[PDB]
Amino acid sequence: ATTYNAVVSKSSSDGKTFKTIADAIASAPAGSTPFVILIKNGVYNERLTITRNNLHLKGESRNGAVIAAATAAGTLKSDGSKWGTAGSSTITISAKDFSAQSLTIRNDFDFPANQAKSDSDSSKIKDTQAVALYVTKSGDRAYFKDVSLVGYQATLYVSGGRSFFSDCRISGTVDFIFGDGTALFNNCDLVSRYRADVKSGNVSGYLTAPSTNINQKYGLVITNSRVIRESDSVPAKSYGLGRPWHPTTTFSDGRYADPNAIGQTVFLNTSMDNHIYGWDKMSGKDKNGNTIWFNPEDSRFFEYKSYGAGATVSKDRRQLTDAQAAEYTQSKVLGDWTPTLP
Numbered sequence: 072a073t074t075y076n077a078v079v080s081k082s083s084s085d086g087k088t089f090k091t092i093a094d095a096i097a098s099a100p101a102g103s104t105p106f107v108i109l110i111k112n113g114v115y116n117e118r119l120t121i122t123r124n125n126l127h128l129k130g131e132s133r134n135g136a137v138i139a140a141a142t143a144a145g146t147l148k149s150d151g152s153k154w155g156t157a158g159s160s161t162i163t164i165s166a167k168d169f170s171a172q173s174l175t176i177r178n179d180f181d182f183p184a185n186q187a188k189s190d191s192d193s194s195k196i197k198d199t200q201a202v203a204l205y206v207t208k209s210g211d212r213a214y215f216k217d218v219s220l221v222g223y224q225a226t227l228y229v230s231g232g233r234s235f236f237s238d239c240r241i242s243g244t245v246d247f248i249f250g251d252g253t254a255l256f257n258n259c260d261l262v263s264r265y266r267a268d269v270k271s272g273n274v275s276g277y278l279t280a281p282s283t284n285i286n287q288k289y290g291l292v293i294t295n296s297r298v299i300r301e302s303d304s305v306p307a308k309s310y311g312l313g314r315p316w317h318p319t320t321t322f323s324d325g326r327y328a329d330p331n332a333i334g335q336t337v338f339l340n341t342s343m344d345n346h347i348y349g350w351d352k353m354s355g356k357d358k359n360g361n362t363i364w365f366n367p368e369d370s371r372f373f374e375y376k377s378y379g380a381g382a383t384v385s386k387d388r389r390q391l392t393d394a395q396a397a398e399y400t401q402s403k404v405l406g407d408w409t410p411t412l413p
C-alpha cells in the first residue's frame with residue numbers, strides 16, 4: 072500500500088497537482104504524521120529547506136525527476152553578503168525522519184566555467200563550494216534511496232545525526248562528501264569528476280572530508296560501493312579517498328580549526344579505479360592564526376577488502392581485520408534506526 076498526500080507536476084493537464092515542490096511541502100498539515108509527495112518527471116528549479124518531521128519525497132524516476140539550483144558559497148545575496156557553504160545548498164534537511172527516493176538533486180554552479188574565467192574577472196568566485204544536499208544537526212534519520220547527488224566541490228554536506236544512502240550516485244571533485252554526521256553509503260557509485268583546471272601532476276580532488284568528532288563512534292562509512300572516474304581523462308592517482316577536515320569553529324579562546332574533529336572514513340568491500348592514490352592531509356588555521364596541517368595517519372581512515380586498480384595495500388593505507396570489519400554493519404552504524412520508506 073503506497074498512497075500520496077500531494078503530487079507535483081509540470082503539466083496542468085496531468086491532474087490535481089502542485090506546480091512547485093516547495094508549495095507541496097508547505098501544504099502539509101502542521102505536525103509529525105507521515106506526509107508523502109510524488110514528484111513527476113521534470114526539472115524543478117527550486118531551493119528547499121525541510122523543517123517538518125516525517126516528510127517524504129518520491130520522484131517518478133531518478134533519471135527524470137530533478138531538483139536543481141545554482142549557488143556557490145561565494146555567490147552574493149541581495150545585501151551583498153556571501154551565501155557560504157551551508158547556505159549554498161540546493162536542499163537543506165533540518166527535520167527528522169526525512170526520506171527521498173528516485174530523484175536527482177543538483178547544485179548547478181558551473182565550477183569548470185568559473186575556473187576558466189580570467190583572474191581579473193570580478194565575477195570569478197573563490198569560495199567554490201556548492202552543496203547539492205545538506206543534512207543539518209537537526210536532520211537525524213535521513214534516508215536517501217535511488218537518489219543522485221550532483222556537484223563539484225562539496226556536493227554532500229552530512230552533519231549531526233544519522234543518514235543512510237542506498238543505491239545512490241554521488242559526483243564531485245573536492246571534499247564531495249563532508250561533515251561530522253554518521254553517514255552510511257551502501258551500493259553507491261561515487262563519481263570523481265574531471266578537472267580541466269588542474270595541472271598534469273597535481274591532485275584533482277578528495278572523495279571525503281570527514282569532521283567527525285573524536286568521541287563519535289561512526290563518521291562516513293562506505294560499503295559495497297563503486298569508486299569510479301567520470302571519464303578516462305581523470306588521471307591515475309589524481310583523487311584521495313579522504314582528507315581530515317577540522318572545521319573553523321568558534322571556541323571560548325577564539326575561532327580556529329577544531330582539534331577534536333578527527334574525521335572517520337571507512338571503506339568496506341568497495342571497488343576503486345586507479346584514479347585513487349590513497350589518503351591525504353588537509354590544512355586549517357590554529358588558535359594563533361598559523362597554518363596547521365592535519366595528517367591522514369592521525370585520522371580514522373580505514374579500508375577493508377577494497378578491490379579494483381585503485382585498491383593498493385601499503386603502510387599508508389591501514390586495513391581493518393575481519394573482527395574490526397564486523398563493527399561496521401548497518402545495525403552497528405545506524406543503531407536503533409532501521410531506514411524504511413513509506
Ligand SMILES: COC(=O)[C@H]1O[C@H](O[C@@H]2[C@H](O)[C@@H](O)[C@@H](O[C@@H]3[C@H](O)[C@@H](O)[C@@H](O[C@@H]4[C@H](O)[C@@H](O)[C@@H](O)O[C@@H]4C(=O)O)O[C@@H]3C(=O)OC)O[C@@H]2C(=O)OC)[C@H](O)[C@@H](O)[C@H]1O[C@H]1O[C@H](C(=O)O)[C@H](O[C@H]2O[C@H](C(=O)O)[C@H](O)[C@H](O)[C@H]2O)[C@H](O)[C@H]1O
Nearest residue numbers: 155156157200225245246249269270273274275276318319
Ligand atoms: C568541505 O570543505 C571544502 O570544500 C574546503 O574548501 C577549501 O579548500 C581549498 C580549495 O577550495 C580546494 O580546492 C583545495 O585546494 C588545494 C590547495 O589547497 C590549493 O592551494 C590548490 O593548488 C592550486 C592548483 O590546484 C594546482 O594545480 C597548482 O597550480 O597550485 C594551485 C595553488 O596553490 O594556488 O588547489 C588544491 C586542489 O585543488 O586540490 C584538489 O583545498 C583548499 C584548502 O584546503 O585550503 C585550506 C577550504 O579552504 C577548506 O577549508 C574547506 O572548506 C570548508 O572548511 C572551511 C573552514 O574554515 O574550515 C569553511 O568552513 C566554515 O564555514 C562553513 C560555512 O560557511 O557554511 C561552516 O560554517 C563551517 O562549520 C565552517 O568551518 C568552508 O566554508 C568549508 O567549505
